[PDB]
Amino acid sequence: PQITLWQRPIVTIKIGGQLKEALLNTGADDTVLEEVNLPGRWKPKLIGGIGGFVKVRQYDQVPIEICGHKVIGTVLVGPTPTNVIGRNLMTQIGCTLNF
Amino acid sequence: PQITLWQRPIVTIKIGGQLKEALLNTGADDTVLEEVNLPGRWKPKLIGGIGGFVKVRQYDQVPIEICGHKVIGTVLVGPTPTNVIGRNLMTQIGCTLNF
């Protein structure tokens, strides 16, 4: 786990053989990570839309471990001010908002 | 409630005598709402930081009801692509991430 929100909900992830940190972001539809070298197929994707668009590489069905939970989901790889775990992967780990 | 994340976590809020909808956004430090007239004191605040800054009005200790929970917190008022409930108010309502 239960994570309070007094601080930014940053968690450890394992992806592409690397240990990283990322923000659990319920405001983000998608997961965007930088500085990861993923194997297998990708396609370009345009995201954002403020000031222009940002182009990222979309990798589907990527195995990823998020705070101990091994799941699978789409990961967008490209520049991002902060590594972000979006709703697409929070659903996979069974993460809910509770109050 | 327990809110799953397959869809955007949009909730009803009551603010400044108006009913509105806003996104529960654990990636946002602050709460930003558009098209609300709040009474009482404010100061300008610069937020964002990509492409420049956005100036908003900071109102402190604003009463707000979020999905039935009457709380108090800082509300930033300014045009925002989407109304956002940030961590500052999610803490007030006792909202946690759980998995």
Partner: peptide, 7 residues
């Protein structure tokens, strides 16, 4: 912070 994605 103001973190997002839509997209």
């Amino acid at each position: 912070q103001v973190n997002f994605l839509g997209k």
